[PDB]
Each structure stands twice: as C-alpha cells, then as structure tokens.
Design an enzyme around this catalytic site. Structure first.
Site, short mmCIF file in Angstrom:
data_model
loop_
_atom_site.label_atom_id
_atom_site.label_comp_id
_atom_site.label_asym_id
_atom_site.label_seq_id
_atom_site.Cartn_x
_atom_site.Cartn_y
_atom_site.Cartn_z
N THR A 1 0.94 -1.20 0.00
CA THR A 1 0.00 0.00 0.00
C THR A 1 0.93 1.19 0.00
OG1 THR A 1 -1.73 -1.01 1.44
CG2 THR A 1 -1.75 1.35 1.18
N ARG B 1 -5.55 0.94 -7.13
CA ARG B 1 -6.32 0.03 -6.27
C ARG B 1 -5.98 0.15 -4.79
NH1 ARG B 1 -3.53 -5.33 -5.47
NH2 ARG B 1 -5.63 -6.00 -4.84
N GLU B 2 -4.79 0.66 -4.49
CA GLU B 2 -4.36 0.79 -3.10
C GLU B 2 -4.75 2.06 -2.37
OE1 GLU B 2 -0.17 0.11 -3.43
OE2 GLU B 2 -0.54 -1.96 -4.15
N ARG C 1 -7.75 2.29 -0.07
CA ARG C 1 -7.71 1.54 1.19
C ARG C 1 -7.61 2.50 2.38
NH1 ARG C 1 -3.03 -2.99 -0.38
NH2 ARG C 1 -4.25 -4.06 -2.00
#
Length: 137
Positions: A1, A21-22, A25
DNA sequence: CCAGGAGAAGCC
DNA sequence: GGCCACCGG
C-alpha cells in the site's frame, strides 16, 4: 500500500494500477477508525512525508489530497486503456472535516517518492511498461 | 489455459 | 509477536 507524490501521467503502467487500487484503502482505514471514535489527534502522523513506518498513517489527515489524486489516477487508467470498473472516487463527505485536509509536498518529498519508484523499476527495467511499451529497458 | 506480480498497520 | 476498490510459452 503505497501513496506516490509523483506526476500520475509519469507513472509506469504497473505502478499506476497499483496505486489506483491501493489508495482507496486509506479511506476505509480512516472510516473504520472514526467508527471506533478515533480522532486525528489519536494518531502519530509524521510532520514530513516518509515511506516505511508511518507511511499510510501520514495520509490519515490528508484525504482531500487523496481524493483528488484518485481522480487523476482514474483518468490516467482510462487514458491508457485499462479496463477498470470503479471510475469514480467514493464520496468522503461523511468523514469528519479534520481528516480531509489537502496537502502540498515539498520538492524533497516528491523526490523521495520518485526515488522509490525508480528503485523498483531498476529491479525489472525490461519488464515495466508505459502505455504497454518497455521504455525503461 | 489463469497465475504471477505491480508492506504498513490493524487485530488476536 | 506474528497472522486490503488489472495487464503472456
């Protein structure tokens, strides 16, 4: 991440997809914390950008910076032809204003971020791609 | 034919 | 002291 501070349009294909995509988070991590009554003061949060320990937490109070970067990551993904599904950033207006600050890195921070990207590329220079091309070879 | 490959910190 | 929004033989 890993959150990068470099020009989204400069990212290598694989680094672009990773951050895309990270980054979201972090919104989840913070929301869950607000759920447990956590406040911004309850976190360390380095005064300067760092990689390694403290890296993710560093952005816990910079979600507006992240929201704006995800918009760029998304646009870049579509520009290069990535078949991504989530083309919008989640709404974060439900999160306390204190966690939603903007952020303007200094050249050193941006350079530290770039050095990490460059170090990863140097490990597989013929493999990373840009718009599908092995330009780092 | 579909698996490899792009780590900080929350939780027991 | 450990165990989370995709692109080629």
């Amino acid at each position: 991440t890993r959150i990068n501070l470099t020009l989204v349009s400069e990212l290598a294909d694989q680094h672009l997809m990773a951050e895309y995509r990270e980054l979201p988070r972090v919104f989840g991590a913070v929301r869950k914390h607000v759920a447990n009554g956590k406040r911004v003061r309850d976190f360390k949060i380095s005064p300067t950008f760092i990689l390694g320990a403290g890296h993710v937490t560093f952005f816990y109070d910079k979600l507006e910076f992240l929201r704006k970067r995800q918009i760029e990551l998304i646009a870049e993904c579509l520009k290069r032809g990535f078949n991504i599904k989530d083309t919008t950033v989640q709404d974060i207006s439900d999160i306390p204003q204190e966690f939603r600050g903007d952020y303007i890195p200094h050249e050193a921070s941006i350079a530290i971020s770039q050095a990490r990207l460059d170090e990863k590329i140097a490990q597989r220079p013929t493999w990373y791609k840009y718009y599908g091309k092995a330009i780092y070879a």
